Design a protein around this ligand. Structure first.
Ligand SMILES: [Mg+2]
Ligand SMILES: [Mg+2]
Ligand SMILES: [Mg+2]
Ligand SMILES: [Mg+2]
Ligand SMILES: [Mg+2]
Ligand SMILES: [Mg+2]
Ligand SMILES: [Mg+2]
Ligand SMILES: [Mg+2]
Ligand SMILES: [Mg+2]
Ligand SMILES: [Mg+2]
Ligand SMILES: [Mg+2]
Ligand SMILES: [Mg+2]
Ligand SMILES: [Mg+2]
Ligand SMILES: [Mg+2]
Ligand SMILES: [Mg+2]
Ligand SMILES: [Mg+2]
Ligand SMILES: [Mg+2]
Ligand SMILES: [Mg+2]
Ligand SMILES: [Mg+2]
Ligand SMILES: [Mg+2]
Ligand SMILES: [Mg+2]
Ligand SMILES: [Mg+2]
Ligand SMILES: [Mg+2]
Ligand SMILES: [Mg+2]
Lengths: 73, 119, 155
RNA sequence: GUGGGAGAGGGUGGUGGAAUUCCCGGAGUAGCGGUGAAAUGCGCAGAUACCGGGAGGAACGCCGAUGGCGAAGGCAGCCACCUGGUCCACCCGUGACGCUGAGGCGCGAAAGCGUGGGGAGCAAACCGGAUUAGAUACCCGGGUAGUCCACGCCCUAAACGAUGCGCGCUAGGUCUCUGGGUCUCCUGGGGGCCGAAGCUAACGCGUUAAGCGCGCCGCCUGGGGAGUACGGCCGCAAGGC
């Protein structure tokens, strides 16, 4: 449904190319370290495409997770 | 025999049988049970009831060691798995938390024919 | 009954007790549509639960049925060439049907030669908690349980 | 030419984490696994389940699409280097330098072939369990070639849009990717759907033509025999044309 909000509208401006900005970046992953889809990241074909490479960069550097444990169930 | 109080309850669900493994605070197994451990021999170890019985067997056996609360960690997708959870919840043991940790590749080994054809 | 859910055919109250359950029980006894001899047998049975019990027959009757009622039963259901015995709840309607039917059944398996004796003694042992009727009830409930494994085929 | 742009386009090196397997340690005990049921099989020389460490090979979750790139085959973890194509703006330079293309040369998925290496998982053949009237199968347990790398070869395909390339002309609507602009929209390149005229045996196609036209190549000429025989060329072979 994605009736929640858009991760983009839920914060100000930011350098999508900044792979060390853990703060704003982690804001784009799900409960699990998975990269949120546009229906929820509120990004654009192009924007969302860069987030992709940024997040992946931070991941290797050890700043962002490749995966998380689903708490609850 | 070595009173552990709190620990970990691991549920390993599957389409073929369930098996719970209680461990101490850092992964080491205190006691375990399964659909086989109990009476069920074949097609019903997977059955949700078997899941219940097994989870409960894990409880008792674990309670004897003087345990009274554990974190549940579910792995796998299988018939009767939430039953194990519900079981442990009623087992007496306090279910501190629950967490699915089923492993998934990021695409490693070619699955057997039985599991191929996915998209 | 493919169209609409059948009507629970309403029965007329008992002439002697004004109870519908009694009639029902009387009907299960009746064969070849001989309601007289049917009604008779039952009443003589009540009179016998007297010369032998300081309790009112109807009291006995009611309690007898209540004990022969199964609360769980097995019903088949195919799922891969092999049909499993699925245990499920028994609705009151059938719960009652099965009880009365079983009473008259067990009763007629009995050795006493006279009809009303067989029925009174069965009603009697019924409330007591023993006898062939209550037996069937128990063998049944045993069938469920013995199949909890397949309970997940509720429906 | 100058200034800009998006891209899984190609080559080389490096590197990340998830998972499987195997090995080492810990803890633990009676099964695990598998199925419509089962059995073969694995486990008290201690398996399955669980925690820690290690080794190795292969693939790259989410992003991910209606997406993008390429002439096709085909191409996505991340980083760097090397390199191809291409789009837009400016209107700056050359001055018809153009289109097509028999033969030629190059590329060309999978399987297959040669030498060497590699080998985690998968799995032709094969070894078994089950099903069945039988079961040289479908299901289950194993398992070799192979699947991976290098170098050489093979050249096929539902190699498909079953639609050769180029150019000009002929309503629009809507979604989308990427660029420019005076940016609730105009303009350009690409991806979809609906539809004007028109086309079509029909289904359908319809500015991404299967419309209206010009240029050049390729190809068809009832079915079976047959993609066979023969011959030739190519290939180590299998075979290919
Ligand atoms: Mg009916
Ligand atoms: Mg000029
Ligand atoms: Mg001049
Ligand atoms: Mg040419
Ligand atoms: Mg090739
Ligand atoms: Mg190959
Ligand atoms: Mg080879
Ligand atoms: Mg070799
Ligand atoms: Mg195998
Ligand atoms: Mg076989
Ligand atoms: Mg096999
Ligand atoms: Mg041509
Ligand atoms: Mg359009
Ligand atoms: Mg713009
Ligand atoms: Mg267009
Ligand atoms: Mg467009
Ligand atoms: Mg028309
Ligand atoms: Mg024409
Ligand atoms: Mg028509
Ligand atoms: Mg159309
Ligand atoms: Mg001919
Ligand atoms: Mg002919
Ligand atoms: Mg041929
Ligand atoms: Mg030759």
């Amino acid at each position: 449904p994605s009736r929640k909000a858009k991760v983009k509208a839920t914060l100000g401006e930011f350098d999508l190319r900044d792979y060390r900005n853990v703060e704003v970046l982690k804001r784009f992953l799900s409960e699990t370290g998975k990269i949120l889809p546009r229906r929820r990241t509120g990004l654009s074909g192009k924007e969302q495409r860069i987030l992709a490479k940024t997040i992946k960069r931070a991941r290797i550097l050890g700043l962002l997770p490749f995966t998380e444990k689903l708490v609850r169930k | 025999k070595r009173q552990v109080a709190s620990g970990r309850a691991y549920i390993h669900a599957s389409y073929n049988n369930t098996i719970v493994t209680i461990t101490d605070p850092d992964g080491n197994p205190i006691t375990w049970s399964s659909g086989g451990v109990i009476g069920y021999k074949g097609s019903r170890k997977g059955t949700p009831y078997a899941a219940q019985l097994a989870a409960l067997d894990a409880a008792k056996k674990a309670m004897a060691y003087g345990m009274q609360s554990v974190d549940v960690i579910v792995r796998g997708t299988g018939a009767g798995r939430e039953q194990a959870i519900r079981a442990l919840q009623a087992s007496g043991l306090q279910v501190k938390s629950i967490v699915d940790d089923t492993p998934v590749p990021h695409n490693g080994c070619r699955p057997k024919k039985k599991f191929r054809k996915a998209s | 009954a493919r169209r609409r859910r059948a009507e629970v055919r309403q029965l007329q109250p008992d002439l002697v007790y004004g109870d519908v359950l009694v009639t029902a029980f009387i009907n299960k006894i009746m064969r070849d549509g001989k309601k007289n001899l049917a009604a008779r047998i039952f009443y003589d049975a009540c009179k016998i639960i007297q010369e032998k019990t300081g309790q009112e027959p109807l009291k006995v009757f009611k309690q007898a049925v209540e004990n022969v009622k199964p609360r769980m039963e097995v019903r088949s259901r195919r799922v891969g060439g092999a049909n499993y015995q699925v245990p499920m709840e028994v609705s009151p309607r059938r719960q009652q049907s099965l009880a009365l039917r079983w009473l008259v059944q067990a009763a007629n398996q009995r050795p006493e030669r006279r009809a009303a004796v067989r029925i009174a003694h069965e009603l009697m042992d019924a409330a007591e908690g023993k006898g062939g009727a209550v037996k069937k009830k128990e063998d049944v409930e045993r069938m469920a349980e013995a199949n909890r494994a397949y309970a997940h085929y509720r429906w």
